[PDB]
């Protein structure tokens, strides 16, 4: 009970006849730029003068400009940039710089929905959020309509990336946002890496070899999930062995019970959800990411790191 | 801290000149007795008589007959064959057909590991477990040594298959039947899945659309778990963007907190190494697998499910 | 809002040209068998050569056959013998002597709904479940509808038995197999019995006589299950004094305490659902049901049924 | 099992001919300066114009310079100014001045350890940190070695500090930095005041004299730590009487409980090596020190400061 919209719903007249800036060229920032170029739009790359990324975005043969440059010449400003440097963008290059009436797009809600960029009140604001025809979905938002047309200019632009194709979904940068936040932190790398790591300290302190504890705590994870991904958990189920069905049955609750974990994930949502997490990751990058930087030396330290290069040589031969 | 064999310690003189019943045609079967006559080892296939396998397999274009036929003229008798079937099969169809000192094979340890399967005194029993040059591993074992070659006939074994390749390791019996059960009750099957289920209900229960839980849950989980793969844990942190890794590093824990979490897979291995698990199962087969087909019902019921289907519909366009 | 049938929504066309099998002479096979003769359906009773129940059959006025012999001339098979030798006399004597499309019909629900009865996929299979014109309503089932007319064939059966006139309703195996065991073991009678035992106990051990604490905890039970029975809750404690309507208001909840007491009603429920309470079963009757023997023992043993015999002993006089 | 290193492994030709800049002028700069010059260094202090410790370091005799200025002029540049200020000064004064290839030194790690110096990756990174023959030791580390010969050029400044002599103990940054935090919080400060002021508040609440209080519970730790300090833990239990002796081996347990005590101080260090602590504090200078200020406030005001001015007044006579 969702509202789709695909390419026959999306006019790329309302793109076709404006100028977009792309700001950043990481992967997001070179296939945006790409596939717009490659549907005739005229695109120019905003960049800080002699970075990696400008020779980089010279050699795919991009028009490229400093960033104030590229946004005084544009109509729709597409910000493909770290969430911690957007708003200083923002503030000091592009609020400044960009027509009124212009159209400020993003890929991710995080700074405007918490606040970071709070955009003028002329401006179109939206999202295209994608996650040949390759079956690659996206999400479509509008924070702020000024001109009567952000939503079909939004839609327009999924378009114009070959997004449109395998369905654009309406949604709220709210939702956008809060999911992507919780996904991150209770399941995808928060959850799914404390559990592996869990497994394979366990096998290792019961004294099996760090090599086995790897490939079945490790390796085989993608086996299942190749399976999750083309026919969902219960098709997961029907693939693995009875014997693994019936282990998964009967032992997956005692490994992550369900009441517990889900009171745990609440509050997870909880601090997404009231600003708490977008506070501390904020002050974090004021004060040179002491947190991160200790963090990532930790883990990068773990035993399981030295058998992972290992194994993972020892494969490719 | 591992004994590594490669397709130089492997000398294909122990198998070449030997007979193999392979016993099963599932992946396993097909992939096993594909791979040995593409290596030069005559091989034939035992099935029971008009079975939808015995059909497949003739349509490979190998030779098929009936187990106790098949079990007769062999030299190695590899049981590919489900864990709950393997012993019957054994007690009325290989124990009395299989020349003395003859080898019997496996591709899993649990039927030897828990008894199910008291091999003759004047077998060799040895197991290949996989996981061109396509870089897959296998481990080798030897239960029951008669002749004194079971371990270079087992490493031909592995050799003929093209499991040699990437490299094989020797262990035992037990460590690969242990960590095999534990990988897919505490980490693979078991807690994945319900950690992702806990994340989906966790959305969804706080009014989020369940298109977008499945998005952020279950879809995603391919890209994370790809660049483990590829990278382990390090460069999967290294490729993520930096609010996700500091969200993982500084939340990861409070959605699966690292002791408790211990203390619950313990308890999983506990079941493993004690033997009750591999009686429960026993016995379970006994009467119907009365839980297995409860649990995947309710499982297969489960909102998740309809969402999910939806939503790859969709991008399958 | 649920579905009723009448004797008016069932054609007896339907069974009438139709041979049925009853298995087992019980109370239920005699009461099936009688019933179905005196509406003028062809009527044979299957059993084991010179039982007990062989000779009562006869003594009754019916065609008694073995049982294989009663199933090969039969186009509707009725088993009504105890859960536990269900299975059994369906694999060795009902699976290969009932004919193709032929019908297979239940009481009770328990040994399709855990699969310890596979039917054979050309079967119809069925229940009618009952509970002059006495008000005995029915519930009806269809599991398996090979021939089309699975549900007019059971609604007929229910009419031929007598079931009809009060009302037949339409559910599933899994409703009538989970509610019916819910109800014996967290209430009806395992439930009930704990709860009359710790009142007796309770008194007795405070030194009240145990004459009177069975007066008080047992034989006054019937006098209010009765007006239950016929007025409900609210019509019981219409008829009930005030003084005990006023106790039941403000001490029942002391006795029997209601979220602790749902909490453990949902495991009891949980285990039922999960298919663990029929695997318990099933194992106890593998290894000659020990725990039931011992039970049984314990419970005749204990001194509520020496009192119970001698005061029911001097009131019949 | 530690590497130590004396004046003969220190070669003052790796310093001597380099001019050092020391920015800061509290007891450590006093000190560095000093030292520096008496072993025939060319040394400069830096610090801002007007200061009150501009006017202090002329009448020590040494030539002053604007900071800036200093660092032009220099080949090493040791910073000695409080944790909180090295940051700024090291952005806006040090990083556009000093010349290529140059020795950027402290004498604790603290700000390059959590990132708030991203030292250049031209610079030589070290540090000496000292704790006639006066037996002071030093620890000396590496971070960062541009030139080759960060190492000599560490520990010859060692030896032209007079640090050498009781011997210089090679470590990291991290192992400096963390047990140093560690020391503060857990014992050395915040664990003893802690225990001084639950004895002297234990004694005062009942009812004795809050003079004697202060003696017991304050002044006569001098006594204890002084034969610590001299002949460690065994010589102070030696020299104390044998009811003071008895008392210590019988009833410090139950004043601090060694379990307990060592879980919180586990907690203490997590968030020390965490980055948590260093966050915490990086955004208490960012607003103006709020809880330091408070808690001073809280503490001056504290009833064990009257009576220790009282009675420190009463014995200077």
Redesign the interface.
């Known amino acids: 009970t ?1 509202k ?1 919209y695909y390419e026959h719903d999306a006019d790329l007249g309302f793109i076709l006849g404006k100028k977009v800036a792309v700001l950043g060229f990481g992967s997001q920032g070179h296939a945006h730029a790409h596939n717009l170029k490659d549907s005739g739009v005229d695109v120019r790359v905003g960049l800080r003068k002699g970075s990696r990324s400008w020779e980089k975005a010279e050699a795919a043969g991009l028009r490229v400009l400093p960033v104030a440059e590229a946004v005084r010449e544009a109509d729709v400003v597409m910000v493909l940039l ?3 440097k957007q708003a200083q963008v923002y503030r000091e290059e592009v609020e400044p710089n960009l027509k009124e009436g212009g159209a400020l797009a993003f890929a991710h809600g ?1 700074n405007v929905h918490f606040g970071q960029i709070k955009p003028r009140k002329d401006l179109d604001v939206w999202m295209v959020a994608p ?1 040949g ?1 390759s ?3 996206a ?1 479509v938002a509008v924070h702020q309509d000024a001109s009567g047309s952000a939503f079909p200019t939004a839609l327009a632009y999924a378009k114009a990336i070959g997004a449109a ?3 654009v ?1 309406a ?1 709220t940068f709210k ?2 946002t ?22 394979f ?3 290792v302190e ?1 004294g ?2 760090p ?3 790897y ?12 399976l ?2 083309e ?4 098709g ?2 029907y693939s ?19 009441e517990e ?2 009171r ?6 909880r ?1 997404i959800q009231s600003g708490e ?1 977008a506070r ?2 904020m ?2 990058n ?11 030396k ?3 330290a ?1 035993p ?2 030295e058998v ?2 290992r ?2 040589a ?4």
């Open positions: 969702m789709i770290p969430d911690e995080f996650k025809g079956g690659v979905p999400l194709r395998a369905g979904i949604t939702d956008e809060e999911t992507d936040l919780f996904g991150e932190q209770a399941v995808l790398c928060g959850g799914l890496t404390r559990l592996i790591r869990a497994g300290e366990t096998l019961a099996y070899p090599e086995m504890a490939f079945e705590t490790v390796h085989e994870v993608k086996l299942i999930v190749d999750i991904y026919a969902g958990l219960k997961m189920r693995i062995s009875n014997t693994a069905e019936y282990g998964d049955y009967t032992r997956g609750d005692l490994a992550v019970p369900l974990t889900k745990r994930m609440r509050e997870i949502l601090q997490f501390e990751w002050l974090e004021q004060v040179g990411s002491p947190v991160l930087e200790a963090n990532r930790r883990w990068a773990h399981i790191e992972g290069s194994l993972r020892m494969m490719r031969s």
